[PDB]
Every structure is written in structure tokens, then in C-alpha cells.
Prior knowledge:
This is part of a larger assembly, with 2 copies of chain A. The first copy, chain A, is mainly alpha-helical and 48 residues long. In chain A, 19% of the residues lie in helices and 0% in strands. Chain A has 2 helices and no strands. The longest helix of chain A has 5 residues, at 18-22. Chain A is elongated and about 40 Å long. The first copy, chain A, starts with 17 loop residues before the first helix and ends in a 5-residue tail after the last helix. Chain A binds chain B through residues 14, 16, 28, and chain B through 3-5. It is classed as viral protein. Chains A, B: Spike glycoprotein. The organism of A, B is Severe acute respiratory syndrome coronavirus 2. Gene of A, B: S, 2. Method: cryo-EM, 2.9 Å.
Amino acid sequence: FVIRGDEVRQIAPGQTGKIADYNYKLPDDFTGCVIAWNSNNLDSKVGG
Amino acid sequence: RLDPPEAEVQIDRLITGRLQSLQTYVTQQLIRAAEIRASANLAATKMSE
Lengths: 48, 49
């Protein structure tokens, strides 16, 4: 998926926030990797 | 007052403390029971003899 650049850290396991609490929650004992990278030039549009 | 992670950390601290307390109490009780059993064996021997 794609989310806010400043909310990427919010995706960490056992975290609190709007994204984690509402649309995507990870378990406290999550076992895996999280990869994230800016996609401004590929997703953001000049017109919004 | 706390959320899952730090609540679990604090509860683990409390669990460790209370488990140590229980183990200390049980060891003291075992030693005291050994003493009382020695006394009771002496009392039984005294009764018999």
C-alpha cells in the first residue's frame, strides 16, 4: 500500500496512531521485515 | 495507565518479584517442615520409650 511519508514509523509493531489503530494494525509479536520508500515522483500528481 | 508493550514490561517485573517471594516462602516452609519433622520423630520416640 501507500501511506503518508511521516506516518511510516507509525507502522511499527505495537504502535499507536490513526493508521495503526484504524486501517492496518500489526501484532505485538510481529516477525518479519518492513520496507518503505518515497514514491513522490511516481504517485504524487502535479494536479494532486 | 500504560499500553500493551510497557504494561507487559512492568507486569513482567512484578511477576518476577512475586515469583521470587513465593519461592523464598516455600523454601523457608520446607526447612521449617524439616525441623518440625525432626521434632515430631523425637516426640514419637519419647512416647514409645
